[PDB]
Design a binder for this molecule. Structure first.
Ligand SMILES: [Mg+2]
Ligand SMILES: [Mg+2]
Ligand SMILES: [Mg+2]
Ligand SMILES: [Mg+2]
Ligand code: NA
Length: 140
RNA sequence: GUUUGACUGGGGCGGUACGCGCUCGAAAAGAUAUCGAGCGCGCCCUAUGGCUAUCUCAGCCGGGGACCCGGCGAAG
């Protein structure tokens, strides 16, 4: 049963929602791979009327690139609880989000016969705290 | 020397139902009138055309009315 039910980290998105950049540079070094532009939608008063327009960057890290990052990111954060997803996710911080899920996720991300992951096989906030807390730190 | 139009609950004044498109009137095929009700067109676009690749939207919810992540979401 287990082994295929035990949590794992799938991508950690580090993004800097600026309002118009030079910031990529640090993201590249804090993570280890190129950043991606962040265009914005809708015209608004914060002199942000431009639809297509660089207004920040993000970086999606997977596997080791994500651990080797969290092995310093987490330590720089304290928070826990309430600040967790209903799907077992949590964002802290410059933002650093951690998407967590179990082994059969590809079923909902592939092209052919894709399917949505059953509520039971989903990751709960609690089942999430456990996994992570059980990895160099403490909850709440 | 001539012209100075037509429609019109008489004619004039007002209006254009004088060329066009849609809903209703219209009676569950088609056709269908009034100065019938609601309202539009006389353009604009080198992309706002064409194809291919990749992709899924509104709105709401939860975590850090811009941006980022997850979820619900046949279509508003
Ligand atoms: Mg004569
Ligand atoms: Mg005369
Ligand atoms: Mg007459
Ligand atoms: Mg008919
Ligand atoms: Na005439």
């Amino acid at each position: 049963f287990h082994e295929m039910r035990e949590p794992r980290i799938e991508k950690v998105v580090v993004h800097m929602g600026i309002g118009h950049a030079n910031a990529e540079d640090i993201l590249g070094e804090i993570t280890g791979q190129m950043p991606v532009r962040t265009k914005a939608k809708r015209t608004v008063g914060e002199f942000d009327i431009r639809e297509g327009d660089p207004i920040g960057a993000k970086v999606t890290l997977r596997d080791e690139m994500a651990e080797e990052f969290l092995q310093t990111a987490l330590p720089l954060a304290e928070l826990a609880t309430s600040q967790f997803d209903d799907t077992g996710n949590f964002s802290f911080g410059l933002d650093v989000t951690v998407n967590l899920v179990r082994p059969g996720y590809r079923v909902a991300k592939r092209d052919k016969a894709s399917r949505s992951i059953p509520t039971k096989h989903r990751l709960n906030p609690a089942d999430a705290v456990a996994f992570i807390e059980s990895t160099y730190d403490v909850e709440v």
